[PDB]
Design a protein around this motif. Structure first.
Motif, short mmCIF file in Angstrom:
data_model
loop_
_atom_site.label_atom_id
_atom_site.label_comp_id
_atom_site.label_asym_id
_atom_site.label_seq_id
_atom_site.Cartn_x
_atom_site.Cartn_y
_atom_site.Cartn_z
N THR A 170 26.27 46.03 103.08
CA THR A 170 26.15 45.07 104.17
C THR A 170 24.81 44.37 104.06
OG1 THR A 170 27.44 46.58 105.55
CG2 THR A 170 26.32 44.76 106.68
N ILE A 171 24.86 43.05 104.01
CA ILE A 171 23.63 42.25 103.95
C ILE A 171 23.42 41.62 105.33
CG2 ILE A 171 22.38 40.33 102.83
CD1 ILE A 171 23.01 42.83 100.97
N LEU A 172 22.26 41.90 105.94
CA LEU A 172 21.93 41.38 107.27
C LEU A 172 21.13 40.08 107.23
CD1 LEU A 172 22.13 44.66 107.54
CD2 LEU A 172 21.21 44.20 109.84
N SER A 173 20.42 39.85 106.14
CA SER A 173 19.60 38.64 105.99
C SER A 173 19.27 38.46 104.52
CB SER A 173 18.31 38.75 106.81
OG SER A 173 17.44 39.77 106.30
N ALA A 227 33.86 39.69 98.77
CA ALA A 227 32.79 39.38 99.72
C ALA A 227 33.31 38.52 100.88
CB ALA A 227 31.62 38.66 99.01
N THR A 228 32.90 38.89 102.09
CA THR A 228 33.25 38.14 103.31
C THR A 228 32.14 38.28 104.33
OG1 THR A 228 34.33 40.02 104.45
CG2 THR A 228 35.79 38.49 103.19
N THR A 229 32.17 37.44 105.36
CA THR A 229 31.27 37.66 106.48
C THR A 229 32.08 38.21 107.63
OG1 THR A 229 31.41 35.39 107.29
CG2 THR A 229 29.65 35.87 105.70
N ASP A 230 31.45 39.06 108.43
CA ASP A 230 32.13 39.69 109.54
C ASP A 230 31.75 39.15 110.92
OD1 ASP A 230 30.32 42.91 109.47
OD2 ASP A 230 29.81 41.00 110.41
N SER A 231 32.36 39.72 111.95
CA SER A 231 32.20 39.19 113.30
C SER A 231 30.82 39.47 113.90
CB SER A 231 33.31 39.73 114.22
OG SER A 231 33.28 41.15 114.23
N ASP A 232 30.05 40.35 113.26
CA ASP A 232 28.67 40.59 113.66
C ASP A 232 27.71 39.60 113.01
OD1 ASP A 232 28.96 42.89 115.36
OD2 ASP A 232 29.24 44.14 113.56
N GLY A 233 28.22 38.76 112.12
CA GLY A 233 27.35 37.84 111.37
C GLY A 233 26.74 38.46 110.13
N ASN A 234 27.32 39.56 109.68
CA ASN A 234 26.81 40.21 108.48
C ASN A 234 27.64 39.85 107.27
OD1 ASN A 234 24.62 41.42 109.85
ND2 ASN A 234 26.00 43.02 110.61
N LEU A 235 27.01 39.89 106.11
CA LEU A 235 27.70 39.63 104.86
C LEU A 235 28.12 40.99 104.30
CD1 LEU A 235 28.46 37.87 102.26
CD2 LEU A 235 26.02 38.09 101.65
N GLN A 236 29.43 41.22 104.28
CA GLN A 236 29.99 42.45 103.70
C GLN A 236 30.36 42.17 102.25
OE1 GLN A 236 29.70 45.24 105.18
NE2 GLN A 236 29.77 44.91 107.40
N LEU A 237 29.49 42.57 101.33
CA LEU A 237 29.77 42.29 99.92
C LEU A 237 31.04 42.96 99.40
CD1 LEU A 237 26.15 42.39 98.57
CD2 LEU A 237 27.60 40.33 98.70
N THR A 238 31.25 44.19 99.82
CA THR A 238 32.45 44.95 99.47
C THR A 238 33.32 45.24 100.68
OG1 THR A 238 31.05 46.97 99.45
CG2 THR A 238 31.61 45.97 97.32
#
Ligand SMILES: OC[C@H]1O[C@H](Oc2c[nH]c3ccc(Br)c(Cl)c23)[C@@H](O)[C@@H](O)[C@@H]1O
Ligand SMILES: OC[C@H]1O[C@H](Oc2c[nH]c3ccc(Br)c(Cl)c23)[C@@H](O)[C@@H](O)[C@@H]1O
Ligand SMILES: OC[C@H]1O[C@H](Oc2c[nH]c3ccc(Br)c(Cl)c23)[C@@H](O)[C@@H](O)[C@@H]1O
Ligand SMILES: OC[C@H]1O[C@H](Oc2c[nH]c3ccc(Br)c(Cl)c23)[C@@H](O)[C@@H](O)[C@@H]1O
Ligand SMILES: [Ca+2]
Ligand SMILES: [Ca+2]
Ligand SMILES: [Ca+2]
Ligand SMILES: [Ca+2]
Ligand SMILES: [Mn+2]
Ligand SMILES: [Mn+2]
Ligand SMILES: [Mn+2]
Ligand SMILES: [Mn+2]
Lengths: 237, 237, 237, 237
Positions: free
Chosen positions: B105-108, B146-157
């Motif tokens: 999870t990428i936050l920034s 890779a997708t972005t989620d409802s929290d605004g995080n980038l979920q690489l996997t």
């Protein structure tokens, strides 16, 4: 149609479509018929600088166009741009010639966008700066006649091998990455742009001008947008 | 094949392909078999920060990965990167899971590149900063899972709807615009990147890791690059 | 005594105090006797550019000094600077002349410091950029002979009203605000500086040189620091 | 007297000196009697953010003060600030308490000034960013009661050892370096500032407020500027 916000450096007065009767700078919101203009004594053969700024709190789009030692021309317009434009945009430069002609040479171009909330660090930023242009500018989307030359300059409109400008030309350069200029949760959004340019011409009345513009991401040169429409609009409405 | 330079946050020791026998950070130059590594006591469930830097004068690629109050892990490698990489690149984040799994999870994420010459202003710069990610990140090229989620995080996997990580996943996010990292006439080129991340896992030995990477502009996930190859390489050569 | 870290552009070889026998650039850590040097073919009468960089992860202080189309000279030294320097410093430019002379003219100067932790935003930053200098530069501490001239240039050492350089001169300019370069809790600290300069001279062997330097905040020109000691050190130890 | 431009976060309505009858934000040009105000529902006990911006082309000073999820309050005023202010200034934060009280706690503060001409690089820039404050902030001029605490926060007004706010307090923090905000030859000058703050209070009507302000470089807390005058003005004219 595309959604266009632009600052025009309009060298040629097309009074039949609402231009003032003199070269002018202007703020264009979804129409070639500027919402605000100022008299521009353009200096053919001299390098000019344009600085454009906006933020969503002040809601005032402003531009200043200057030649060192000679003139500083300013124009502003109050508008909520984040109401006009989509949330994601591309930013670009356009230029045209028509029956009359001029070089539309860009020597440098920079841009900054910020989307802020609750921190001294802006929740989102994009910045680019080009103090020259490469022979294959892979971070630009070149449209129409736009190319870079052997001096490292961006020639928006067609020039011959000796640098002489050609008529009936249109060209645009977009920055490759879409820019996120608004989100419903943003506290403030802002952008700034600067470019330097060189308009040369053998014509007694050079034409047609250069713009900095912001548009829907999938923006393309509209059919019939040559000359007086600055490569931005399909008509003069 | 692609040309890859990467900093790996490698959670899973694959000793059969040259990993140390412990979780580690590493510098990868055209091979998964890191040129330099450091022991990384990764803290599952905690937000980490990675800072990566390089300039063409010092020619030392360095990374530091930290968790507040607990650990700061550093790795460096002397290499002329502008010799290894093409002049134009894309920059990105990758992650994988394999038989074992973790959230990636990428936050920034922020990045700056500069290409300098004979002025206090860098002949070329690109900067972006994301302190969160939109539901449709139009300035990212999302690859694989890779997708972005409802929290605004980038979920690489891949993660399920409750946030549980899935195995056998690979994903990457590239910044949309190519980056000009070298020109033969450059005096100095530099880049910096920071990202924050959150690796959670139910597995006793989480896998596989996250990278920041730089590649040819047309880079794509290689066939067979899952798990231990971090979505970067077609093999373990 | 002061605590000094400097990059020297040393025009005059003082072999009796350890200089190489040619004009050179160098890294000075608490001594005029450089820890690392490189041969510098300095071009009197031409505008040069110096770029200096450091970060606490790589621990490599580097400098590159260039004249367009002619030469790029590089020097580096591995050193933990945050071990050498106090936590708060002032940054500055120095220059001297001695028996021999040269103009020590600064045309521009920029500097950036960052002190980072666990975010894509650097817990602390200072940046300044001067592309020219005002007649009363209230954000500079001018020491010794340093002044700004009617062209907007910073003349570190004495020049007559026709611009001719004088011997036996010393001058420094510090940025007014102290800079916080380290804190025990920092994950990474970095700094970068650029300046452009113009050294002219009627002397067959011009002297003495220009430095960019970092020091204790209360730094002052030491007694006996003229000529070969570059306004930085009380002796040649 | 000092020359003051300020954005006030005014928690306490002093209707006898022209305040609206509610907590408000305001633009102050050489008087405590704001030229423009907006109703501010201040949230005691919550961290707020203020963003302030100006450029000399638009000539519109704007501020937005927000608490996440709750409120965004905006105020603007058209004014040529480079006409009001001297060419060199110091920038700062002020706060007071009077008969009533509140903490005036600053958690972060950033500022950028640019002075531009004929290039995509701004002829002059100053930027600083503090995401926390050191125990001895050598780059701040602390005036009156202002101090930094063990949490790394800037307490503009007096708090006891348990963090309880005290009445009859005044404090200011200036950035150490003077800022060059105008030159007769400038094409455009701009500044931006952000700070985050925490106002807590046991009082039913907390007082008095926080400002961001710009002043002559030698600005000092005026005699009699406590309470309602926010540490900025000697009187309520
Ligand atoms: O390039 C300058 C202009 O040239 C053309 O307009 C004319 C300018 N002078 C003229 C004289 C005659 C005729 Br017919 C025309 Cl169309 C024009 C048209 O191409 C315009 O769109 C353009 O603005
Ligand atoms: O996700 C962790 C790892 O899982 C797999 O490797 C194995 C880790 N433990 C094992 C145990 C048995 C077998 Br068979 C395999 Cl392939 C593995 C492979 O997918 C690796 O590429 C990956 O690094
Ligand atoms: O400016 C160049 C140099 O001039 C002086 O040194 C000499 C250079 N050539 C000489 C020749 C004779 C004598 Br005596 C001296 Cl001191 C020197 C001294 O001032 C040196 O510190 C300085 O580096
Ligand atoms: O801190 C809040 C205010 O307290 C004082 O004003 C009063 C607020 N309520 C009062 C009630 C009685 C009297 Br007398 C006074 Cl001076 C006040 C004065 O200190 C004001 O300057 C300040 O704005
Ligand atoms: Ca026209
Ligand atoms: Ca591994
Ligand atoms: Ca010497
Ligand atoms: Ca009040
Ligand atoms: Mn027009
Ligand atoms: Mn590994
Ligand atoms: Mn030397
Ligand atoms: Mn008020």
């Amino acid at each position: 149609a595309d959604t266009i916000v632009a600052v025009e450096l309009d060298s040629y007065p097309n009074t039949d479509i609402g231009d003032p009767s003199y070269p002018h700078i202007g703020i264009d919101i979804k129409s070639i018929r500027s919402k605000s203009t100022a008299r521009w004594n353009m200096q053919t053969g001299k390098v000019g600088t344009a600085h454009i700024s906006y933020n969503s709190v002040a809601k005032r789009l402003s531009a200043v166009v200057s030649y060192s030692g000679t003139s500083s021309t300013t124009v502003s317009y109050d508008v909520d741009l984040n109401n006009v434009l989509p949330e994601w945009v591309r930013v670009g430069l356009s230029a045209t010639t028509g029956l009359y002609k001029e070089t539309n040479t860009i020597l440098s171009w920079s841009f900054t966008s910020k989307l802020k909330t609750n921190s001294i660090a802006d929740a989102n930023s994009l910045h680019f700066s080009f103090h020259q242009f490469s022979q294959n500018p892979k971070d630009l989307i070149l449209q129409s006649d736009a190319t870079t030359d052997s001096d490292g300059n961006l020639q928006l409109t067609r020039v011959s091998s000796d640098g002489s400008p050609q008529g009936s030309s249109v060209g645009r350069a977009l920055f490759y990455a879409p820019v996120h200029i608004w989100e419903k949760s943003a506290v403030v959004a802002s952008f700034d742009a600067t470019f330097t340019f060189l308009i040369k011409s053998p014509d007694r009345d050079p034409a047609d001008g250069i713009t900095f513009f912001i548009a829907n991401t999938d923006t393309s040169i509209p059919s019939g947008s040559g000359g007086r429409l600055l490569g931005l609009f399909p008509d003069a409405n």
